Write a protein that binds this ligand. Structure first.
Ligand code: CL
Ligand code: CL
Ligand code: CL
Ligand code: CL
Ligand code: CL
Ligand code: CL
Ligand code: CL
Ligand code: MG
Ligand code: MG
Ligand code: MG
Ligand code: MG
Ligand code: MG
Ligand code: MG
Ligand code: MG
Ligand code: MG
Ligand code: MG
Ligand code: MG
Ligand code: MG
Ligand code: MG
Ligand code: MG
Ligand code: MG
Ligand code: MG
Ligand code: NA
Ligand code: NA
Ligand code: NA
Ligand code: NA
Ligand code: NA
Ligand code: NA
Ligand code: NA
Ligand code: NA
Ligand code: NA
Ligand code: NA
Ligand code: NA
Ligand code: NA
Ligand code: NA
Ligand code: NA
Ligand code: NA
Ligand code: NA
Lengths: 142, 49, 142, 150
RNA sequence: UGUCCCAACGUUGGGCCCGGUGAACUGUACAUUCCAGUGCGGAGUCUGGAGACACCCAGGGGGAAGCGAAGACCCUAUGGA
RNA sequence: CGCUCUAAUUGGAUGGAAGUAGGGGUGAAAACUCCUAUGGACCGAUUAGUGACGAAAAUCCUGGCCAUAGUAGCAGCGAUA
RNA sequence: ACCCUCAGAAGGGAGGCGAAAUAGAGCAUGAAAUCAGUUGGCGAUCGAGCGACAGGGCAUACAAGGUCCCUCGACGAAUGACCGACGCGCGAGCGUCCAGUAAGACUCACGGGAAGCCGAUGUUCUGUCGUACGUUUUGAAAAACGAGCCAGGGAGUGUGUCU
């Protein structure tokens, strides 16, 4: 609820990792960022394998635990954490001043970062974060 | 004979104690033991002339 | 009604341009503490410097982060070695006769701690009249 | 033996002490910590309740194996050191006594400072299996109390 | 015939809470760890990740190659009996 | 570099020595030195000598002390008081 | 001594002696380990050889250290441009000139400023490096060996001969 994002990024039809990479780089420069339409972000690859990885991540674990998100919500955020030294003071700060949302709760339309967009016309081997989540068993709350 | 006036002996291994000669459970004779002999002491024999 | 130290407390020595620069160098550069390795891990191990002898010693092996090892290269500038931070060359003084031959411009005097208050007073007054500074002066209420 | 570790203005201060008391040095800590800042009069009431077992002494440092007590506040473990608490009534009885004999209102005096110190042990020996013997000592506690006008 | 199928309930003394008394083993240091990897090839401490708010009570003992004993086996000594 | 005692030369101390605590300055350093407090009688320097002369270690020796812990035991016995 | 307290020849308080009772009875001094109370720093969302060197927060009576901060300016090793002009390259971009110029560590001078202020000390945060020490070992952080901690003790000496 209410997040003064100096920058709002739209992930729709954007390569998750390429977005995450830049979103990290900015948050570490002190920028408050909000990622919008997570459920519509995409990651290239053969769907079947891609789901095997993510599914393997949900299954990993023991008493100590290995909490892995199922919602395209977390998925994106965990993807971004992996690009920040989240256990240092600086990093945790940069990670906390960032937020990912399902769809868009703002009025403004997010911008599209350069080099993160995927042309659906010249591309068929890719997957939607949402699609991934539905397989993992999440609750399509979007 | 200073420090050598006793039958102290070492129990050897077996009680988690260092191999030091003991008597009535008190270490003795050896140089590193309080009341022990003086390793290299002053000597009458030495020629100080 | 307030304390006032006796003698030329404010006196400064006159140094050639080279000495003064060399003095400033010593004051700027400084030097490592050179404390005995691991003196901070065990109370029975004091700070007094001892050459690490361990065949596997991490210091003796020069592993960055484990401390500097005493070397000649660490010496202070020939021209300023031993000088008080003021620029003066100290002279240990035990009585009034020790004040004889002392250049009040190049040297300052330090009264040994053993000397009593009676003898101190005499030393402190005649030193001043000789244009010499007393590094450890007596504070009298004036 | 100890000496007052704090400075006390004689015109507004009453002093007292216990010497070589063979009691729990660990309970003393607790009790002292607890009653500090209280009024000699509130203090006696408290300790008498502790002795009655209706009030418990927070055991914050020396608490291994100690059971929780619903009445402790902000903490969980606590007991009722009666022996140590009785020794503290004597101390207080003495300080309120010196307080009055000096013209102050004893009971109404704040407990400015109160500290226990372990001054030694009365050494004892306990025979054990296998023809061996071991320690079996008693701690000797000293305790300083400084009352002060409100 | 409760040795077993297959365990149940009960009795007494402990255990648990309170007052009093009051030890010992053990301790290089640090220490909330887990999964992998690496390393003198069997890591709470290295490396990558994961997890982890602090303190306390009871428990049964998985790990600390847990504690206890300078290995009795084996070989070596120009050792002993 | 530092320690003990000797000798020659030469200094300091009840107008407060040594030692100790905290603190300032020098030396690459062994170490030297000063300040404040405590202490209340001894203490140095230079040179030449002297030697039961420098410790973090030896399951080292002796003493003292903490965690363990307000923990185990103060129940178990055909005599349950 | 006396007085108050106390079951009390205990202890405590007040008081007396003495230069000193923090010289009060195992009583000169009174270290370290370590304990109580307390002050500074840190602190119940966060990672472990406990630090070295840098650089920040907070804290600090004097004394024994007195420096340090910002404008400008002087000097200025190695290194060394932007912009603009012209010419190349499919392109990223390069060449020539501007120019070995501007810049460039330290040091200094004028002016202004700081006294918790500079150093330094205590604690804490950040960066870099960092799995004790000694020993055994080809190889030790080692799941190889030693120590709970501290203090004091603890290991090339004498005679004879030779060189
Ligand atoms: Cl899990
Ligand atoms: Cl991290
Ligand atoms: Cl495609
Ligand atoms: Cl040299
Ligand atoms: Cl205790
Ligand atoms: Cl310079
Ligand atoms: Cl030798
Ligand atoms: Mg002897
Ligand atoms: Mg130390
Ligand atoms: Mg319990
Ligand atoms: Mg027997
Ligand atoms: Mg890790
Ligand atoms: Mg063996
Ligand atoms: Mg055999
Ligand atoms: Mg034989
Ligand atoms: Mg001479
Ligand atoms: Mg050694
Ligand atoms: Mg236990
Ligand atoms: Mg019966
Ligand atoms: Mg004494
Ligand atoms: Mg081997
Ligand atoms: Mg020694
Ligand atoms: Na991909
Ligand atoms: Na999982
Ligand atoms: Na004998
Ligand atoms: Na002789
Ligand atoms: Na505790
Ligand atoms: Na409560
Ligand atoms: Na409570
Ligand atoms: Na049965
Ligand atoms: Na276990
Ligand atoms: Na031992
Ligand atoms: Na600091
Ligand atoms: Na070894
Ligand atoms: Na080692
Ligand atoms: Na190993
Ligand atoms: Na022990
Ligand atoms: Na020796």
């Amino acid at each position: 609820a209410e997040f003064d994002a100096d920058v709002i990024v739209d992930a729709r039809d954007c390569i998750m990792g390429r977005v995450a990479s830049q979103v990290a780089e900015q948050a570490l420069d002190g920028e408050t960022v909000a990622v919008v339409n997570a459920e519509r972000a995409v990651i290239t690859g053969r769907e079947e394998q891609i789901v095997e990885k993510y599914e393997k991540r949900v299954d990993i674990g023991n008493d100590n635990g290995y909490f892995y998100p199922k919602r395209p919500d977390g998925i994106f955020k965990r993807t971004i954490r992996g690009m920040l030294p989240h256990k240092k003071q600086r990093g945790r700060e940069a990670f906390e001043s960032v937020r990912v949302y399902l769809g868009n709760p703002y009025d403004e339309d997010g911008e599209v970062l350069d080099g993160t967009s995927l042309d659906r016309l010249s591309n068929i081997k890719f997957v939607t974060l949402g699609e991934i989540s539905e397989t993992l068993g999440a609750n399509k709350t979007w | 004979y200073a420090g050598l006036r006793t039958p102290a002996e070492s129990f050897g291994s077996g009680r988690g104690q260092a191999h030091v000669p003991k008597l009535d459970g008190r270490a003795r004779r050896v140089p590193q033991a309080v009341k022990g002999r003086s390793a290299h002491p002053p000597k009458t024999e030495k020629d100080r002339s | 009604t307030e304390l006032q130290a006796r003698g030329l407390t404010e006196k400064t020595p006159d140094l050639s341009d080279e000495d003064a620069r060399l003095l400033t160098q010593r004051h700027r550069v400084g030097k490592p503490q050179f404390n005995r390795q691991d003196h901070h891990k065990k109370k029975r191990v004091s700070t007094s410097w001892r050459k690490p002898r361990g065949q596997l010693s991490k210091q003796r092996r020069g592993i960055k982060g484990k401390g500097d090892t005493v070397e000649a290269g660490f010496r202070s500038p020939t021209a300023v070695r031993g000088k008080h931070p003021s620029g003066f060359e100290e002279v240990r003084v035990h009585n009034v006769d020790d004040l004889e031959g002392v250049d009040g411009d190049t040297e300052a005097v330090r009264i040994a701690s053993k000397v009593g208050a009676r003898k101190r007073e005499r030393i402190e007054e005649e030193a001043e009249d000789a244009g010499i500074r007393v590094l450890n002066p007596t504070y009298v209420e004036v | 033996g100890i000496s007052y570790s704090v400075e006390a203005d004689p015109d507004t201060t009453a002093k007292a002490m216990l010497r070589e008391r063979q009691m729990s040095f660990k309970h003393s800590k607790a009790i002292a910590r607890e009653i500090k800042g209280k009024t000699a009069g509130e203090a006696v009431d408290y300790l008498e309740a502790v002795i009655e077992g209706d009030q418990p002494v927070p055991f914050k440092q020396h608490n291994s194996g100690v059971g929780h007590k619903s009445k402790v506040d902000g903490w969980d473990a606590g007991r009722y050191p009666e022996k140590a608490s009785k020794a503290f009534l004597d101390l207080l009885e003495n300080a309120v006594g010196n307080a009055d004999h000096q013209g102050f209102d004893g009971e109404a005096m704040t407990i400015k400072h109160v500290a226990a110190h372990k001054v030694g042990e009365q050494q004892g020996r306990k025979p054990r299996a296998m023809g061996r013997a071991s320690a079996w000592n008693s701690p000797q506690v000293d305790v300083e109390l400084i009352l002060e006008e409100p």
